[PDB]
């Protein structure tokens, strides 16, 4: 894959509309910490300007900082995302989205962006400005398929438990990854972690058999857990940590927005063993940056945070209800 250098969360969510504040990344891990302030929407700003992925249940531009909280009649946001690419052809592209208001309305629209191609010396070059072509091209040189970064790599903090809903949505969703008999290895990598991490003495191995569902294997017969399923979130984690591994690889690797939901000690200590094994086996691969957003001490203190990075990108909030990311070294976490 290819790394991401920076984004630009200017005037979105809880970061102020005045000052540009972006945080940077780490390799082969990008740890984030803090109280539930910025973090869960840091994941929202990568696909936001890449494909125009507004959050579901959002039409009136709720994501931009509301003018009434500040107190003026013209507030907006920008995202220009100075990041890398496949052959090191770094790029910058801004999404000119505004919360500007009419007489008493909240009319929503856009403006033109950019398609610069950053030179290794500095002589950049733009291509074409259209936002439709923006969402056509930024995935093209970004890599990962146009239906995976929103759900698999950069999922939401509560769209994470997606595969355990119903057959039809998932069955029509899997077409986009296929971009239309090729499904043979995704369930192959769906159970070794299940054997390793999931200390459950009930079930052998899940599959995704065609009604795409969450079939348990109870003594070689399929005791379906679609409706008869912690096992849900854990199976969801593994389903993501196979789809991120098989199909597409050119941007990020994995961004687990609080994977450790509803799992106990004999599961929480064994949770990150498969993460470490994935890091170590996939560190032969030229790129990996496991983005975890977590405030679980018994989860952080197992995977030896002081053994892979010198920093966790911490997020806090100032006096004026603006979140300000600081820089605290690896040891200082308790």
């Amino acid at each position: 894959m290819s790394a991401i250098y920076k984004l630009s969360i200017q005037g979105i969510r809880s970061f102020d509309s005045n000052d540009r504040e972006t945080i940077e990344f780490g390799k082969p891990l990008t740890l984030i910490v803090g109280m539930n302030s910025g973090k869960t929407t840091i994941i929202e700003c990568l696909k936001y300007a890449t494909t125009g992925d507004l959050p579901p249940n959002s039409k009136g531009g709720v994501f931009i900082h509301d003018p009434k909280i500040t107190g003026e009649k013209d507030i907006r946001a920008q995202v220009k995302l100075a990041f890398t690419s496949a052959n090191g052809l770094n790029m910058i592209v801004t999404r000119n989205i505004q919360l500007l208001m009419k007489k008493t309305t909240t009319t929503f629209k856009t403006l033109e962006g950019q398609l610069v191609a950053i030179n290794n010396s500095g002589d950049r070059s733009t291509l074409s400005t259209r936002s439709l072509e923006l969402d056509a091209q930024v995935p093209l040189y970004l890599g990962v398929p146009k239906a995976i970064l929103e759900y698999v790599i950069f999922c939401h903090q509560e769209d994470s438990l997606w595969p355990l809903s119903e057959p039809s949505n998932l069955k029509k969703k899997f077409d986009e990854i296929f971009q239309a008999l090729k499904m043979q290895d995704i369930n192959r990598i769906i159970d070794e972690l299940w054997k390793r991490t999931y200390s459950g003495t009930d079930i052998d191995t899940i599959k995704i058999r065609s009604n795409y569902r969450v079939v348990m294997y109870k003594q070689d017969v399929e005791l379906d857990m679609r409706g008869r399923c912690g096992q849900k979130v854990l199976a969801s984690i593994i389903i993501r940590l196979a789809l991120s591994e098989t199909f597409g690889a050119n941007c990020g690797v994995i961004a687990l927005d609080q994977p450790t939901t509803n799992l106990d000690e004999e599961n929480i200590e064994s949770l990150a063993k498969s993460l470490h094994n994935i890091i170590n086996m996939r560190r032969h691969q030229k790129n990996f940056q496991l983005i975890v957003i977590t405030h679980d001490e018994k989860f952080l203190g197992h995977m030896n945070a002081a053994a892979f990075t010198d920093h966790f990108f911490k997020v806090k909030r100032d006096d004026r209800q603006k979140s300000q990311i600081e820089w605290v070294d690896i040891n200082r976490v308790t």
């Binding site: 070794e192 054997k195 200390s199 459950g200 003495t201 079930i203 052998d204 002081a306 053994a307 040891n331």
Partner: protein, 412 residues
Amino acid sequence: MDYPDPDTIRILITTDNHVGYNENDPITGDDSWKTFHEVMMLAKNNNVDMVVQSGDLFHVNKPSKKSLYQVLKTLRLCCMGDKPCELELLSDPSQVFHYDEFTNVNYEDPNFNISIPVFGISGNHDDASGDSLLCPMDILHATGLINHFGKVIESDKIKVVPLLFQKGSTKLALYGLAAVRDERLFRTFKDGGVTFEVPTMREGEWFNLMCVHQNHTGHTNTAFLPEQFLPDFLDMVIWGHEHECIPNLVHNPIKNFDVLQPGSSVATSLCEAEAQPKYVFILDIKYGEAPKMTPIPLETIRTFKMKSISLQDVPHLRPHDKDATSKYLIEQVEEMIRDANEETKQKLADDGEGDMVAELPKPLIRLRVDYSAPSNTQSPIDYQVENPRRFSNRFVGRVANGNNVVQFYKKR
């Protein structure tokens, strides 16, 4: 043994005790602290003048409550007698123990009747972590039953400082560097950011000793401490962080010293390099001749066996088999359990008792199954196995590790 000859200094080499490993297993939940107490008991009656160790005393940087109780309990009543430690301290130890007013070795305190010292370095498993940049060994030194050296303050600025002890006509120089991540050590060794201060009096007389805690062979490119980087004037090294235990010493033809790898005590990872017997060593050093070694074994390690066997090894295994593979592995574990139990029976029988048919401690067993079809055939399916925990939930009451007897890995 008897007391050493009045100009012989005797030291004991332990390492990687890892007390508190698997503290929740009902059976294998007292291996570590029992083994540690056995090492200390093998120290007290062996008439050893000091104990060194290459770190990793506690398993995690925040050791549990039972671990600390065990270590304090073992060190307290078995190290402290009215016998003086004849190693006279002539240096000013205020530099090496600089973290507080405790600026001297344990046996030189007017408040300790410690009859045998034990110098230990920090480990990457119990490194400094939290808010105050604090190690569990810094907690133990605060009790004074251990002595702590090798602690780093700046990763880039490294100043190792020996300690100097005196008895008869034997000069002991003790260089110690704690455990820091290997990439920073390689950077500090690239530019020569280290200092190895050498005593300026009576050269050619001192025994120059080193205790490193770093990896030996790195599968990556440049993430380990190489052997050719330590200085020339050394005489012996103790190489922690490698759990495999080997009794001999590997000789350097250029470096003016030999290497030692004391190994570990407990079996953390049930791996192939974990199946080699645990030893605690004895070094009898004395001016005028090469110091000798008397490696002594341990009688308080639970029996272990290992067999990383793929399903491709034995014939007569169809890909679709589920009962057949389980039955074959069942009888293989049966054979290994028989072998381990009979060797355990002989081990307990050759202690002095052979008539008490009381019990037989369960043998830790590990199976590693690479269930991969041969690459020549094009059949999509693999060699199917059972649930690893419930494949081995039928061994409970016969095996020390009830659940994780097997691990079903893959390897091309």
